[PDB]
Amino acid sequence: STGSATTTPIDSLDDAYITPVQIGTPAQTLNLDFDTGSSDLWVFSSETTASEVDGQTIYTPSKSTTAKLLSGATWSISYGDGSSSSGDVYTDTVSVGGLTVTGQAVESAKKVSSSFTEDSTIDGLLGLAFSTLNTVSPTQQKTFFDNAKASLDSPVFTADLGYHAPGTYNFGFIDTTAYTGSITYTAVSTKQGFWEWTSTGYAVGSGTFKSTSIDGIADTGTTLLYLPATVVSAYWAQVSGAKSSSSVGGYVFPCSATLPSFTFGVGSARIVIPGDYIDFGPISTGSSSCFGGIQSSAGIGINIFGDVALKAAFVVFNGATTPTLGFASK
Numbered sequence: 293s294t295g296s297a298t299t300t301p302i303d304s305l306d307d308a309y310i311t312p313v314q315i316g317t318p319a320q321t322l323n324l325d326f327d328t329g330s331s332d333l334w335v336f337s338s339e340t341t342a343s344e345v346d347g348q349t350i351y352t353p354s355k356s357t358t359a360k361l362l363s364g365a366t367w368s369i370s371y372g373d374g375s376s377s378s379g380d381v382y383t384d385t386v387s388v389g390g391l392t393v394t395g396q397a398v399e400s401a402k403k404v405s406s407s408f409t410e411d412s413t414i415d416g417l418l419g420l421a422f423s424t425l426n427t428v429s430p431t432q433q434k435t436f437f438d439n440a441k442a443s444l445d446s447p448v449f450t451a452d453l454g455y456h457a458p459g460t461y462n463f464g465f466i467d468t469t470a471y472t473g474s475i476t477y478t479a480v481s482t483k484q485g486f487w488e489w490t491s492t493g494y495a496v497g498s499g500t501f502k503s504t505s506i507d508g509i510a511d512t513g514t515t516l517l518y519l520p521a522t523v524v525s526a527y528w529a530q531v532s533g534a535k536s537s538s539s540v541g542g543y544v545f546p547c548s549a550t551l552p553s554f555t556f557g558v559g560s561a562r563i564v565i566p567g568d569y570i571d572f573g574p575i576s577t578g579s580s581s582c583f584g585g586i587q588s589s590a591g592i593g594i595n596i597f598g599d600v601a602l603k604a605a606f607v608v609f610n611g612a613t614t615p616t617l618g619f620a621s622k
Contacts, residue, residue: 293443294464295391299326299453302413305572306599307515309453310413311461314387315398316356322349322415326461327513328451328487328609329596331425331435332369333386334377334399335416336408344404347412353400359384367399367427372514372592377404381428386436388418391463393440397426397433417513420449420609425485437463437611447611451512452622453603455569471606471620476561480615484594486511487609489617491597492559494519496527497552501562508595510602510609510617516572517554517565518589518596527554527586534584540575543584547574554586556601558619565604 299309310323315335322335336345338352353359359382368378379402386396401408401416408414419426423434441447444464452470453459460470481488486509493503506519524543528534530552534545545551551567570585585600608618 293391293440294445294462295387295389295440296460296462297389298458299461300458301454301456302411304456306453306456306603308414309459309512309599310415311388311418313418315351316353316384317358318356319387320349320351320356322351323413324416324418325414325513326418326420326451327511328420329509329511329513330369330371330417331419331421331423331485332367332399332427333397333416333418333436334367334369334379334401336404337379337400339379340401341403344409346409349415351398351400351416353382353384353398356384358394359398362397362428362431365397365428365431365433367429369427372596373407375405375407377401377408379403381433388436388463389461391440391444393436396436396439397428399428420512421487422482422485424482437609440464441611449609449611451602451607451609453512453599455566455603459603466608471622473621475606475608475618475620476558477608477610477616477618478558480617482615486594487615487617492557494523494557495555495562496530497567499530501555501557503557506556506595508589508597510597510607512599512602514596514598515600516596516598517586517600518592518598519586520595521588521590524586524588527552528584536588540581540583542587544575544581545584547580547582549582556597561619563601563605563619563621565601569600569604
């Protein structure tokens with residue numbers, strides 16, 4: 293089998309992407325944030341505290357003839373941005389772009405933190421990291437991809453995120469029309485449960501390429517590119533007036549600037565992030581200070597190849613017995 297679904301930016305900055313997902317019988321369609329940095333499929337629901345729902349579409353398990361309470365199971369997750377959610381668990385039928393999994397754990401939120409409530413466009417998350425990170429207790433549950441894998445034509449999914457435009461998540465096949473050149477594959481460590489890999493270096497604008505190993509994660513659920521402070525300083529030093537602002541929480545730059553590109557290495561191949569992809573707009577409405585799309589990872593503990601980087605590439609998440617990542621230009 294295969295599946296193919298369009299993913300759409302939630303706003304004009306590409307802060308995140310939503311993909312429609314059918315849950316239950318008859319189908320209830322929710323718009324989920326596909327997150328290769330986590331491993332829980334959780335949704336706003338009829339069980340979510342009413343004051344914490346503000347415009348989201350909810351899953352109502354009592355209206356699904358295929359929903360079954362997973363007795364005793366609870367979940368609770370905290371994300372790198374400080375947000376969180378928790379609740380109980382149903383199993384139900386879940387379909388993405390024509391690919392159906394029966395018995396998928398659907399984690400129903402009883403509580404969500406304020407940033408989820410405040411984002412009316414995201415009805416939940418669909419985790420695509422390794423199932424060892426799934427938070428369901430006392431019986432850990434499998435991701436949608438893990439459940440689908442054996443049925444897929446090939447044990448892969450691909451992320452093709454757009455810049456200020458829709459893109460595509462495919463399951464079970466590699467669309468050879470969706471990228472240019474060849475796909476360069478690189479080794480993955482699953483030891484932390486992430487799609488963790490090592491970039492071979494970077495360049496700033498038209499500058500020379502610096503060969504240096506940068507370990508990080510391919511994370512569709514993170515907006516920006518988080519890299520070591522040395523690398524980030526070298527980038528922003530090329531932008532007149534750019535500075536790191538403790539009050540804002542990262543590098544800012546004059547909105548009048550034209551940003552240089554940023555290149556990252558995948559083996560001997562190179563992915564170029566255009567400068568425009570690194571502009572996240574005014575820090576507050578009407579400000580002439582703009583927020584940068586490349587930020588330091590120094591306070592995180594891990595480097596994160598988030599949407600800023602991934603949307604410059606066609607990205608293969610290869611879930612073969614030994615997983616690997618593939619990157620192609622597009």
